[PDB]
Amino acid sequence: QYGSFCTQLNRALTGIAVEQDKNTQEVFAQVKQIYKTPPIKDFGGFNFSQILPDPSKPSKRSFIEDLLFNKVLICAQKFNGLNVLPPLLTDEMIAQYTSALLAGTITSGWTFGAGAALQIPFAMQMAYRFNGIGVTQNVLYENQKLIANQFNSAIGKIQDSLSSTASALGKLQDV
Amino acid sequence: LQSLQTYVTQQLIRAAEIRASANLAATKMSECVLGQSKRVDFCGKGYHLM
Amino acid sequence: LQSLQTYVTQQLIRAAEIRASANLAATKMSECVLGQSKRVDFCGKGYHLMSFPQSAPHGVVFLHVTYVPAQEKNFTTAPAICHDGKAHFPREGVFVSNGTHWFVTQRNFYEPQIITTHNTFVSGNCDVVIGIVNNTVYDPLQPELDSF
Amino acid sequence: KKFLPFQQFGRDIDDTTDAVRDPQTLEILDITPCSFGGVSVITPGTNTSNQVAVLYQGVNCTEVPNVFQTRAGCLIGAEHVNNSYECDIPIGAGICASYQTSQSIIAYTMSLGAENSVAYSNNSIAIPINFTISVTTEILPVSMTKTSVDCTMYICGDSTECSNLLL
Ligand SMILES: *[C@@H]1O[C@H](CO)[C@@H](O)[C@H](O)[C@H]1NC(C)=O
Ligand SMILES: *[C@@H]1O[C@H](CO)[C@@H](O)[C@H](O)[C@H]1NC(C)=O
Ligand SMILES: *[C@@H]1O[C@H](CO)[C@@H](O)[C@H](O)[C@H]1NC(C)=O
Ligand SMILES: *[C@@H]1O[C@H](CO)[C@@H](O)[C@H](O)[C@H]1NC(C)=O
Ligand SMILES: *[C@@H]1O[C@H](CO)[C@@H](O)[C@H](O)[C@H]1NC(C)=O
Ligand SMILES: *[C@@H]1O[C@H](CO)[C@@H](O)[C@H](O)[C@H]1NC(C)=O
Numbered sequence: 001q002y003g004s005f006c007t008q009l010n011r012a013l014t015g016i017a018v019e020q021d022k023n024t025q026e027v028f029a030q031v032k033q034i035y036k037t038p039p040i041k042d043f044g045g046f047n048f049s050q051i052l053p054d055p056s057k058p059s060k061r062s063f064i065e066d067l068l069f070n071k072v073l074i075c076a077q078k079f080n081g082l083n084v085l086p087p088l089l090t091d092e093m094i095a096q097y098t099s100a101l102l103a104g105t106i107t108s109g110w111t112f113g114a115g116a117a118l119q120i121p122f123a124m125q126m127a128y129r130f131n132g133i134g135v136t137q138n139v140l141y142e143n144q145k146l147i148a149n150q151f152n153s154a155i156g157k158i159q160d161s162l163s164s165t166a167s168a169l170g171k172l173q174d175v
Numbered sequence: 176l177q178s179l180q181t182y183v184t185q186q187l188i189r190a191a192e193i194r195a196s197a198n199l200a201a202t203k204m205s206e207c208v209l210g211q212s213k214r215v216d217f218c219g220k221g222y223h224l225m
Numbered sequence: 226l227q228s229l230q231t232y233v234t235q236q237l238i239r240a241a242e243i244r245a246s247a248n249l250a251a252t253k254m255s256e257c258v259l260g261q262s263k264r265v266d267f268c269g270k271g272y273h274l275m276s277f278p279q280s281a282p283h284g285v286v287f288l289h290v291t292y293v294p295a296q297e298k299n300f301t302t303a304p305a306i307c308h309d310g311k312a313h314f315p316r317e318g319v320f321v322s323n324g325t326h327w328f329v330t331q332r333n334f335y336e337p338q339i340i341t342t343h344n345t346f347v348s349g350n351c352d353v354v355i356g357i358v359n360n361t362v363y364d365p366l367q368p369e370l371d372s373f
Numbered sequence: 374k375k376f377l378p379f380q381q382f383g384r385d386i387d388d389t390t391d392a393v394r395d396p397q398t399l400e401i402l403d404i405t406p407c408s409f410g411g412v413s414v415i416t417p418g419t420n421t422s423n424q425v426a427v428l429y430q431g432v433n434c435t436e437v438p439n440v441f442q443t444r445a446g447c448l449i450g451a452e453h454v455n456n457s458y459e460c461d462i463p464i465g466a467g468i469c470a471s472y473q474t475s476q477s478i479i480a481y482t483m484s485l486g487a488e489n490s491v492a493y494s495n496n497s498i499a500i501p502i503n504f505t506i507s508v509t510t511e512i513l514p515v516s517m518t519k520t521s522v523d524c525t526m527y528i529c530g531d532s533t534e535c536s537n538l539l540l
């Protein structure tokens with residue numbers, strides 16, 4: 001006798017679910033062809049080994065991703081018609097887009113967001129990324145090995161920063 | 176029916192705070208990642224490299 | 226009363242979804258149309274040239290005009306060049322070669338040129354940079370004096 | 374799970390009955406609600422065809438009455454295909470269904486676009502030579518339909534009694 005109340009709720013919730021799927025699709029699927037890095041790592045002297053995926057692992061998730069996933073019932077609420085649908089993209093596919101964007105960024109620069117990937121030596125790329133913030137290209141080459149140490153060391157601390165306290169991921173853990 | 180209607184409404188609102196973060200992450204992944212930015216204090220604190 | 230209250234609330238939420246699309250359109254209508262935008266993947270998909278608004282029933286439609294490259298040719302390169310100890314760098318462009326000679330071009334359109342002092346700037350000596358290659362750098366100011 | 378000598382039946386964090394102690398024999402049983410789910414229908418256009426594939430969500434195929442067990446649930450009426458293509462009608466946990474070989478409803482693991490590899494080297498730059506101009510298009514809603522609704526005419530059918538009760 002209470003009319004069509006349930007239908008409104010179900011429509012709203014289904015809209016939310018479809019919206020969540022579209023959210024993940026829009027955030028991650030910015031790339032059309034899945035690239036992947038060459039077998040050799042002559043990246044001018046930069047140790048990308050923490051962020052690139054590691055084969056010696058069940059999933060293809062890289063080190064930092066593994067740390068984050070470790071950093072962060074089902075039937076308890078489920079007794080009363082509260083089902084929870086599964087996400088469309090699996091947590092492995094998401095880790096596949098990411099390993100593409102990393103691969104394309106390192107080897108192609110930014111020209112893979114416009115057309116197709118264009119090969120460029122990494123050491124020559126950052127020379128163009130400086131040249132867009134004022135300092136001439138000569139600063140990079142003349143001090144290439146110095147910057148490599150600072151950059152490599154920089155990733156050193158962030159790994160320990162996450163693995164020190166659990167208050168780093170406050171934003172997701174609230175959700 | 177009141178309680179069920181309250182939970183739905185809270186979801187509808189709270190599920191719009193996220194939609195204002197997905198449309199913000201989806202931006203940063205298009206300037207910061209796929210390019211170099213000049214929006215000061217958008218992609219990090221300082222002059223942005225990559 | 227409950228039936229009417231629910232309908233009003235939904236509208237307020239829906240009317241706040243549109244308000245965030247009449248502000249993302251009133252922005253694209255500003256950078257995209259009235260100027261050239263360098264915000265990657267904001268106006269179109271690729272390097273952006275201009276835009277053309279059009280109307281529609283309860284909305285707006287854009288026609289972004291975009292620039293994308295077509296054919297890619299592999300080439301050999303070197304991040305510097307040494308002539309007389311002094312390294313030489315491209316003022317704006319890459320250093321490219323086709324096996325016999327070297328050339329300097331633009332970033333986004335193959336157009337070789339002769340490596341003269343008119344478009345390179347020296348810096349330091351050539352025993353510090355890595356990947357530098359020996360070559361000659363032509364001097365434009367010599368021949369006219371030799372002509373006289 | 375073993376209770377205390379006097380404690381009879383347990384609860385959860387959300388105070389729902391979970392276990393129980395049998396009266397005649399002091400033995401411990403666990404209660405689990407018998408299954409439910411949402412029946413769903415995957416179909417292409419009615420104009421295109423009239424074959425549909427039914428999807429039970431979170432129900433084991435054994436208790437449901439071509440089958441297939443996907444993480445989403447049980448899917449009957451569709452055929453698994455090893456080959457992977459772009460998604461047509463998304464289902465759940467990386468499975469897409471479409472209508473192509475007559476034709477039948479095929480379910481498959483979704484393909485994350487094509488695959489490509491690039492040849493990075495110490496000294497290799499690819500410099501494009503030719504260019505093309507394109508024209509994209511996108512649509513943004515601007516304004517929904519203005520409307521107005523007076524209460525007293527909706528709630529009350531223009532009668533004195535209703536108008537003086539709503540006051
Ligand atoms: C560039 O060289 C690589 C490796 O030989 C090759 O796979 C690729 O097709 C070449 N690209 C062109 C268009 O010359
Ligand atoms: C109930 O009676 C049966 C049969 O005599 C016996 O085996 C069982 O132990 C009794 N249980 C209780 C609660 O006395
Ligand atoms: C039905 O499908 C056919 C083939 O795709 C098409 O030519 C025809 O116009 C469609 N008619 C409908 C359903 O409007
Ligand atoms: C389905 O039921 C059978 C028999 O109880 C069981 O062996 C199987 O593991 C169950 N599968 C799932 C998906 O739970
Ligand atoms: C097709 O997929 C099924 C399920 O993963 C697998 O058992 C089977 O071996 C696959 N067959 C082929 C031809 O790859
Ligand atoms: C070029 O890279 C290869 C690995 O891809 C390496 O073996 C070789 O030594 C490098 N040569 C130079 C110029 O450093």
